[PDB]
Amino acid sequence: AMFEQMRANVGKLLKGIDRYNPENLATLERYVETQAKENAYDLEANLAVLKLYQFNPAFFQTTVTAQILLKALTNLPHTDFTLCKCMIDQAHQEERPIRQILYLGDLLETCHFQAFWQALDENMDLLEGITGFEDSVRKFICHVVGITYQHIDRWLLAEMLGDLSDSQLKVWMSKYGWSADEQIFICXXXXXXXXXXXXXXXXX
Amino acid sequence: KMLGYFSLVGLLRLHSLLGDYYQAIKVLENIELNKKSMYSRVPECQVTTYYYVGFAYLMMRRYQDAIRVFANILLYIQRTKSMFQRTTYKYEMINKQNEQMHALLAIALTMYPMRIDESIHLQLREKYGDKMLRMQKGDPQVYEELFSYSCPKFLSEPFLQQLKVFSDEVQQQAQLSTIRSFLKLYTTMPVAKLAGFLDLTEQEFRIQLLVFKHKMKNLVWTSGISALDGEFQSXXXXXXXXXXXXXXXXXXXXXXXX
């Protein structure tokens, strides 16, 4: 679709110095919109966009910036979200809704999943166009769960994944191969020589 | 090419002051050039390069690279705790700049290892020593207050550092270290003891959350957490022993050679 069609041109733009010309923002912003709708992704292009905004303040676009940050979050545990923050100055991070989005990201980074879902205005405008946003977040959560739990309450996992029905929970357990148990099932000679040498050294 | 390298370093610094983090990092990556030309031309240039490297390290998550570059620019306490003493050849203004760089490094330096060193630094000032004490205490209330009082030092341009971002990030890492320091080592631990210790942390509910969160970090390991019981459970050895023996021998060698 559109993402694949723009990919070549954007890649070429990023290979050269035109990536520093704000006249190319219109093209890069439509590219970001396509990433959201098709659930496609291009970090390099998104960082280039943020850079263009920082260098040419008058072009700062709230929606595109918010989508870039939200998509970056969908790429956790990778450093995407942190890199984007490095590309936005304090004044802009403090503006609505960038401030709110960074706050949500903070909940995810600090792994406060229940708090995240609670604070997440499910009917938030910016989220509607970001295809698969909620499921992408769940993948990160399952990544963390697979690392921090040996066993976990079935009810607790569903809560952490955004208050899922038992049927929806089953989808994620199936995806990572977790199964319920009692509950959901989730998960000489050389040395001697060395001593001899050490001893000799000590004696000496 | 030394002059060109200096131009790159200055330009990179300017970009950092008014410039994005990644481009500056790339410039730094190109930037390093043989030591010797810099040494022949002037004492100071090398110190400036070291400072730039330290800044890059600070921007970088790792504090290790910056720790080395800063010590070379200025003397730093070595692994095995031996004093590192720097040359005084560089011009006095440059030396003052180097001292400022060393003061900046303390922030990187504390992260690198240990522990309570300010011997090279003047005893009288409470700005750095007080900060060291607060870290030793392990209580944020003192740490937070230290930032609050020496708010002025952090600010020193204002747009460039509008929000104090780096200091806050550093403090949050600093708060976590003490809890890991108990570092488990107990097969099974009473919940109440954990609660008493986690209570000190600002969030009351953190231990249910703060304890599980620590496990996710992996700095400290918790066993049986989230259990119905509610009580946490907590060749290789030979290798460790051999390592120690090696260190002992090394110390002896240095003694004999001396």
Q: From chain B, pick out residues whose CB is under 8 angstroms from the CB of A144.
A: 216
Buried-state track B174-209, b at ≥16 Cβ within 10 A, e below 16: bbbebbeeeeeeeeebebeebeeebeebeeeebbbb
A17, A20, A78, A86, best to mutate vs chain B, most B CBs in 10 Å: A86
Radius of gyration of chain B (CA): 22
Structure tokens at A147: 């690392």
In chain A, the residue whose alpha carbon lies closest to the alpha carbon of B253 is A201
In chain B, the residue whose alpha carbon lies closest to the alpha carbon of A148 is B216
CB pair distance less than 8 Å for B226 and A83: no
Q: What is the Cα–Cα distance from B206 to B195, expressed in whole angstroms? A: 9
CB atoms within 10 A of CB B238: 12
Name residue B82's amino acid: S
Q: Region of B60 please: left (phi>0), alpha (psi -120 to 50) or beta.
A: beta
Half-sphere exposure of A8 (CA within 13 A, CB side): 4
Half-sphere exposure of B26 (CA within 13 A, CB side): 5
DSSP string, B43-101: HHHHHHHHHHHHHHHHHSS-SHHHHHHHHHHS--PPTTS--------S-HHHHHHHHHH
Q: E-strand spans in chain A?
A: none
Q: What is the Cα–Cα distance from A148 to A96, expressed in whole angstroms? A: 34
Nearest to A86 among B22, B216, B226 (CB): B22
Name residue B17's amino acid: L
Paired sense of beta strands B188-189 and B232-233, if any: antiparallel
A56, A198, A200, A204, best to mutate vs chain B, most B CBs in 10 Å: A198
**Of B173, B43, B57, B169, whose CA–CA distance to B105 is shortest?**
B57
Nearest to A90 among B21, B163, B253 (CB): B163
Q: Kindly report the nearest CA distance between residue B45 and chain A, in angstroms.
A: 28
Q: Where do the H-state alpha helices sit in B112-205?
A: 126-137, 140-149, 151-155, 165-182, 191-199
Q: From chain A, pick out residues whose CB is under 8 angstroms from the CB of B20.
A: 51, 54-55, 86-87
Whole-Å CA distances, A123 to A106, A128, A132, A134, B16: 20, 8, 14, 12, 39
Q: What is the Cα–Cα distance from B154 to A93, expressed in whole angstroms? A: 20
CB pair distance less than 8 Å for B216 and A147: yes
CB pair distance less than 8 Å for B246 and A198: yes
In chain A, the residue whose alpha carbon lies closest to the alpha carbon of B21 is A86
* Residues of chain A contacting B, Cβ within 8 Å: 47, 51, 54-55, 83, 86-87, 89-91, 93-94, 110-112, 144, 147-149, 152-153, 156, 191, 194-195, 198, 201-202, 204
CB pair distance less than 8 Å for B159 and A89: yes
Q: E-strand spans in B177-251?
A: 188-189, 232-233
Q: What is the Cα–Cα distance from B228 to B238, expressed in whole angstroms? A: 37
Q: How many pairs of residues across A and B have Cβ atoms under 8 Å apart?
A: 56
In chain A, the residue whose alpha carbon lies closest to the alpha carbon of B221 is A148
* Residues of chain B contacting A, Cβ within 8 Å: 20-23, 159, 162-163, 165, 209, 212-213, 215-216, 218, 226, 238, 242, 245-246, 248-249, 252-253, 256
Q: What is the Cα–Cα distance from A114 to A108, expressed in whole angstroms? A: 10
State the DSSP H helix or E strand holding residue A134, giving kind and residue range, or none if neither: helix A133-148
Q: What is the Cα–Cα distance from A37 to A34, expressed in whole angstroms? A: 5
Nearest to A54 among B20, B212, B248 (CB): B20
Q: What is the Cα–Cα distance from A67 to A128, expressed in whole angstroms? A: 11
B22, B58, B255, best to mutate vs chain A, most A CBs in 10 Å: B22
Catalogue the long-range contacts made by B201-204 (C-beta closer than 8 Å, 24 or more residues apart): B201/B140, B201/B175, B202/B140
Q: Which residues contact A21 (CB under 8 A, 6 or more apart)?
A: none
Nearest to A110 among B213, B215, B249 (CB): B213
Whole-Å CA distances, B153 to B19, B123, B127, B147, B250: 22, 18, 9, 9, 42
Q: What is the Cα–Cα distance from B64 to A57, expressed in whole angstroms? A: 35
Give how far the C-alpha of residue A134 lies from the chain's centroid of Cα atoms, to the nearest Å: 11
Q: Which residues pair with residue B188 across a beta bridge?
A: B233
Query: CB–CB of B199/B205 below 8 Å?
Result: no
Q: What is the Cα–Cα distance from B24 to B128, expressed in whole angstroms? A: 29
Buried-state track B10-42, b at ≥16 Cβ within 10 A, e below 16: eebbeebeebbbeebeebbeebebeeeebeeeb
Q: What is the Cα–Cα distance from B120 to A57, expressed in whole angstroms? A: 45
Q: Region of B257 please: left (phi>0), alpha (psi -120 to 50) or beta.
A: alpha
Q: What is the Cα–Cα distance from B130 to A162, expressed in whole angstroms? A: 45
Handedness of CA A57, A100, A127, A73 (dihedral sign): positive
**Of A50, A63, A64, A33, whose CA–CA distance to A131 is shortest?**
A33
**Of B179, A182, A141, A138, whose CA–CA distance to A149 is shortest?**
A141
Q: What is the Cα–Cα distance from A175 to B86, expressed in whole angstroms? A: 58
**Of B242, B73, B100, B153, whose CA–CA distance to A196 is shortest?**
B242
Strand, helix or coil for residue A42: coil
Q: What is the Cα–Cα distance from B214 to B236, expressed in whole angstroms? A: 25
Q: From chain A, pick out residues whose CB is under 8 angstroms from the CB of B248.
A: 198, 202
Resolution, expressed in angstroms to one decimal:
9.3
